[PDB]
Every structure is written in structure tokens, then in C-alpha cells.
């Protein structure tokens, strides 16, 4: 029932009606019909943004620090694998940092949830009542102070599509870090260098067959 | 009119020739009741179809043994396969009853309530399990080539061919067992002996089938 004008993950394939192009990155991909129920699909829409946005930060936070180290840039945290940052010693114990993390995140996340439950109800500064977000914001897209440079005032639809495409690719990359790190046992950029050294004999088929 | 197993004897009333392979053979009237006849019609086909797979498999492996390719006789394959491949027999037996139990339970409740397995309950498949007749599933899974969906006249001809090769295979599988018990050699080992000296090598001289001999 989905129209044929919209982009399709599989050209010439029938696609669900409930994926009608409203959401960004709507390519009609749902072989398991997870998002069939509108109430559930409403939740999954925000979950994708949240998992995507954190994934984009996480991937950026796992490649750039390693990229700088190879270039030779020197800082005390240089040369630490992304999966060894936890063991590293900081100014405060890991437990104390974790406790502060949850208290800070509890405020912002409940603030974000309140808007999702009732959009527009969490757009006012509790202390300095003069401050406020624009009233037209939708769940997942606060705007206002969260968009200081006004990029959202342009072609918003294209920007939403660009965000979700980069976000979906970032989420796949992070799963690659866990799979690659758990198998190869080395940092991600090291795996890329190995592949570029000998692309033909360094496939996952070669690597995994050797192990077993 | 139509030929019967005993020429000159009228066929039974409950056998009207509609079924495939009907020669009016029911001396004990086991299928007099119409509903019981449906059960046996499908029982015969399942027995016949398994026998055809069994006979073809036994014959083919026997040819492999005679030619020297190293196949064991059908009465030793079970022991050889398990030992050579290091397979736990009780695990293999259990796996068989899960797969056979699922597949054969579906056939059971299609007989009880025809068309019930095509309701989309099983992974969303709604037309491959509907069934065409009693004992003839049809569909694009059990009949991928659609030979039951083409010519109607030839499909009836095949039903005649299926049952008669099935009955012949069932008799053959009894021959394999009886010959092994009497002789202790493989199927084609017996065939080679008969062709050597047919007059002096057969069941009447094996010393078992005719004890008074």
C-alpha cells in the first residue's frame, strides 16, 4: 500500500503502509513488522534518534582519539585503547564519577521524557523563567538553545534525513568495534591498516577460519 | 468392467474405482467404513512413499558395494555411519522425532480438519499447507514443479503410477528383509548368485524357505 514514489530499500518490493515517509529515513524497511502498531512505532522513532545520536558521539570518541595518537599528538590519555579507558586512572575514582553521571543524567533524561509524554510542556527554564524554547518544537528536536546557529531554519527535511543516515551508519560502526575488538583483539584503526596492507588475504573469512 | 485382482469376482461395494490403484482388493473388508477408508488411503501412500525411498536407497548403495566404492550393506550402514562419523545415536534419534514429530503432526491435524494448517499460524505460510486431496498435499512446497496444477488428465495418470510403484517398493522392502534373513547376503549379492546358476540357486534350494526340501 506504500506508494512507489518513495525511496525503497529493495526496489520493486511491496512495503508496509504505515511507513508512509513521515519519519526521516523512511525507506520502508521492516521485514519483521516491529513498527506496525502506531503506539510502538512512536516509541521506536525516539529510540532510534537516541541510540543513533549517542552512537555518533561514541564512534567519534573512539576514532579521533586514536587518530591523533598515530599522528604523534601527545596528551596524557594518548595510546589508550577505547576498551581500556575504564581501567585508566583519573583524578577521581570510577565509582564517584559514575554516581555523578547518573544524578546529572537523571535530570536531563526525565526532562526529555516529560516533553515526549506531553510535547511542549518542558520548554521553560525552572530557575530563570525568562528563558524558554520555541513553542513549535517536536519530540526529539528541541531546537531553541539546542540550535544556537539556526541550522534548523533551513531545509529541515533534508537535515533530518542526513542526521538519520549518518546516525544509522554510526550505529553499525560501533557494533563493528565490539565484533572486531572481541575477535581481532586490537584497536579499530589497527584492523583497517591490516586490511589495507593486504586486502585480499585479510577478510573476516581468512581471519576467522584461521582461529577455527 | 475395470480389472480386478481376482478375475471374475465382482468388486466390493465400497470400492468404486475412484481411488488410485483400485482393483477391488479388500477380502477382509477392512475399509468398508467410508471414514476408515480415508485413513487407510493415506496410510498406504505414506507406507508406499517411504518404501520407494527405502528401496531406491538400498539398491543404490548396494551397487556401490558391488562396484567396490566402499559402501556398506544396508543392514550395516547404521553401525558404520555412527562409528565412522562419531555420532551419538540417542541424540540423532531424538532429533529425528522432533523433526518428524512436527512435520507429521501437521499432516495429522490436516486430516482431522482439512485446511487448518493453511491459516498462517506457521510462520505466516497460508497457501503451501492447504492441501489438494486426501494424501496429496499439492502446493508450491510439496509440488514445486506444479505437475498437479497442469494437465488434469495426466495428473490422474501419475496418481496411478505413484501407488503402483509404491506397492511394488513395499513388496521389495519385504524381499530385502526376507532374503537377508534366509541368506545373510546383500540384495545384489543374491541377484548375482541367481544369474550365475538360476536353476540351482534360488529360494527352493537355500535350505530355509522350504524346510522339507
Amino acid at each position: 500500500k506504500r506508494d512507489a514514489a518513495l525511496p525503497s530499500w529493495m526496489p520493486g518490493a511491496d512495503l508496509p503502509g504505515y511507513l508512509n515517509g513521515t519519519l526521516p529515513g523512511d525507506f520502508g524497511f521492516d521485514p519483521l513488522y516491529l513498527g506496525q502498531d502506531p503506539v510502538k512505532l512512536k516509541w521506536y522513532a525516539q529510540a532510534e534518534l537516541m541510540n543513533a545520536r549517542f552512537a555518533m558521539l561514541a564512534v567519534a570518541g573512539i576514532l579521533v582519539p586514536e587518530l591523533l595518537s598515530n599522528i604523534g599528538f601527545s596528551w596524557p590519555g594518548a595510546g589508550v585503547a577505547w576498551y581500556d579507558a575504564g581501567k585508566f586512572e583519573y583524578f577521581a575514582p570510577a565509582s564517584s564519577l559514575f554516581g555523578v553521571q547518573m544524578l546529572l543524567f537523571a535530570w536531563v533524561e526525565i526532562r526529555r521524557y516529560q516533553d515526549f509524554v506531553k510535547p511542549g510542556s518542558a520548554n521553560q527554564d525552572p530557575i530563570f523563567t525568562n528563558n524558554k524554547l520555541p513553542d513549535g518544537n517536536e519530540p526529539g528536536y528541541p531546537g531553541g538553545i539546542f540550535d544556537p546557529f539556526g541550522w534548523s531554519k533551513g531545509d529541515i527535511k533534508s537535515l533530518k534525513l542526513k542526521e538519520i543516515k549518518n546516525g544509522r551508519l554510526a550505529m553499525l560502526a560501533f557494533a563493528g568495534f565490539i565484533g572486531q575488538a572481541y575477535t581481532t583483539g586490537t584497536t579499530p584503526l589497527k584492523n583497517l591498516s591490516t586490511h589495507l596492507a593486504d586486502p585480499w588475504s585479510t577478510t573476516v573469512w581468512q581471519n576467522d577460519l584461521a582461529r577455527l | 468392467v475395470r480389472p480386478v485382482w481376482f478375475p471374475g469376482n465382482p468388486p466390493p461395494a465400497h470400492l468404486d474405482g475412484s481411488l488410485a490403484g483400485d482393483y477391488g482388493f479388500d477380502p477382509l473388508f477392512l475399509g468398508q467404513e467410508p471414514q476408515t477408508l480415508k485413513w487407510y488411503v493415506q496410510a498406504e501412500l505414506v507406507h508406499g512413499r517411504f518404501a520407494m525411498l527405502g528401496a531406491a536407497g538400498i539398491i543404490l548403495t548396494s551397487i556401490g558395494a558391488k562396484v567396490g566404492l566402499g559402501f556398506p550393506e544396508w543392514y550395516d550402514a547404521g553401525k558404520v555411519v555412527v562409528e565412522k562419523n562419531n555420532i551419538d545415536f540417542p541424540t540423532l534419534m531424538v532429533i529425528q522425532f522432533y523433526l518428524m514429530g512436527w512435520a507429521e503432526t501437521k499432516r495429522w491435524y490436516d486430516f482431522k480438519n482439512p485446511g487448518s494448517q493453511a491459516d498462517g499460524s506457521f510462520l505466516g505460510f497460508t497457501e503451501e499447507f492447504k492441501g489438494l486431496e486426501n494424501g496429496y498435499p499439492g502446493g508450491r512446497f510439496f509440488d514445486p514443479m506444479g505437475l498437479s496444477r497442469g494437465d488434469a488428465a495426466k495428473y490422474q495418470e501419475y496418481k496411478q503410477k505413484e501407488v503402483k510403484n509404491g506397492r511394488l517398493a513395499m513388496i521389495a522392502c519385504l524381499g530385502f528383509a526376507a532374503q537377508y534373513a534366509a541368506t545373510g547376503k546383500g540384495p545384489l549379492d543374491n541377484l548375482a548368485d541367481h544369474l550365475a546358476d538360476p536353476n540351482h540357486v534360488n529360494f527352493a534350494t537355500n535350505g530355509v524357505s522350504i524346510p522339507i526340501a
Binding site: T203 | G64, G150
Partner: protein, 230 residues
């Protein structure tokens, strides 16, 4: 009304001559179902097209590279890309090509558009006969060409099977085997090296090794249905 495989016979009802190469041969009635014939039509073209390319390759290999046996070309060939490097490219490239061809068979006209470049597109066509870029040049009438394609294709499919059984029995290439036939035509036929009669059965020996060692692994190499050979 049209030439038939067995002159004087009546073609089956489901065969009427519409398709190219339709000579009324269908003793088992596999094409009776309309949908089944549509699928079987595609597979015959694909099988024939692959066979024609394969048969031509084997002949050219022997002429150009007589030393290498086309049967053993799998292990004989050495390239920097390695075994699994070649397979990886082959899998992904073939998966794309075959799926698109498959999609057109299911829902024709849906995969004609070029994904990357918008302007380019495939003109309307029949299933199994793509046009446009695939057919820059056409020597003559398509109807005649389609008949030529299948008739050569059907011959090629038999030709390849001839190579395999000749290769497995005689242990030689296609041209090399033919030269043997011309040398002693009477003593080289399959009748002159195999025979089965009541009480005795003689079959040729499989000249392909039972197993092949290739880069630290053993590849089984069985002769096709060697137990049923005449």
C-alpha cells in the same frame, strides 16, 4: 504446422510454438503449469548462456594453454588475490547481479532504472531479454536471433556435459579426447571401453584423483555417479 522434435507427432496442448525454440518436446509435461513454464523459461536461457560461455572458454583454454587441464584449472591457477579474496569479490558481485535479474522475473519493469545515475534507464523489454545497454548491436531480426541463441545454447549445454564425462573417463581435454577418437575411432567409443551383460559388468576407471590437496586442505573430487557408470 511447425517442425517438431519427433516428426509426425502431436505436440502437447500447453506447447503451441509461441516461445522461441518451441519444437513441442515435453514428454513429462513439466511446462503444463503456466507459472512453472515462466520460471523454466528463464532457467533454460540462463543455463544455455552460461554453458555457451563455459564451452567456448574450455576450448580456448586448451588451444591457448594446452598444458593446463581445464578440470584442474581450479587448483592450478595462482593469483595474488588468494583463494578467499577471489571468492569474496565473486560472491558480492554475483549476489547483486543475480538478485536484480531475479527481481525483474518476479515483478517486471521495477529494476530497469539505474540506481546511481538517474538519467539512464532500461527500455521496456520481455523477461529474460534485457535491452538498451545490454544490446548495443543487433545483427538482424530478433525473432530469428532468439531461435539461433537457444539452438546453439541447447547444443552447448550438452557439449559441457560431454566434457565432464569425457574428462572423468578419459582424463583428457575436449580437443585432446577428439584427437584420440580420430586416431582409433573403433576402439575409443564408450561401447569399446565399457559393457554390462547378465553376470558381468565392466566400467571405465575414474581417472580423476579421489582427493585433491590445495593449500593445506583436502578437497573431495568424486566422479559423477561413478557407481552407475556402464
Amino acid at each position: 504446422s511447425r517442425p517438431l522434435w519427433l516428426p509426425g507427432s502431436t505436440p502437447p496442448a500447453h506447447l503451441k510454438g509461441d516461445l522461441p525454440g518451441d519444437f513441442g518436446f515435453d514428454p513429462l509435461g513439466l511446462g503444463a503449469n503456466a507459472e512453472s513454464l515462466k520460471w523454466f523459461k528463464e532457467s533454460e536461457l540462463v543455463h544455455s548462456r552460461w554453458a555457451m560461455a563455459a564451452v567456448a572458454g574450455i576450448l580456448v583454454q586448451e588451444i591457448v594453454r594446452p598444458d593446463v587441464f581445464w578440470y584442474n584449472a581450479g587448483k592450478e591457477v595462482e593469483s595474488p588475490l588468494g583463494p578467499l579474496g577471489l571468492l569474496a569479490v565473486e560472491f558480492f558481485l554475483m549476489h547483486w547481479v543475480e538478485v536484480r535479474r531475479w527481481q525483474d522475473l518476479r515483478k517486471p519493469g521495477s529494476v530497469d532504472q539505474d540506481p546511481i545515475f538517474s538519467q539512464y534507464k532500461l527500455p521496456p523489454h520481455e523477461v529474460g531479454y534485457p535491452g538498451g545497454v545490454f544490446a548495443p548491436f543487433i545483427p538482424g531480426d530478433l525473432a530469428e536471433l532468439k531461435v539461433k541463441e537457444i539452438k546453439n545454447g541447447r547444443l552447448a549445454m550438452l557439449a559441457f556435459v560431454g566434457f565432464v564425462m569425457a574428462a572423468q573417463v578419459t582424463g583428457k581435454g575436449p580437443i585432446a579426447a577428439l584427437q584420440e577418437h580420430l586416431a582409433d575411432p573403433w576402439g575409443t567409443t564408450i561401447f569399446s571401453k565399457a559393457a554390462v551383460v547378465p553376470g558381468q559388468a565392466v566400467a571405465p576407471p575414474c581417472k580423476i584423483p579421489a582427493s585433491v590437496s590445495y593449500k593445506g586442505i583436502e578437497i573431495p573430487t568424486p566422479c559423477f555417479l561413478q557407481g552407475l557408470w556402464p
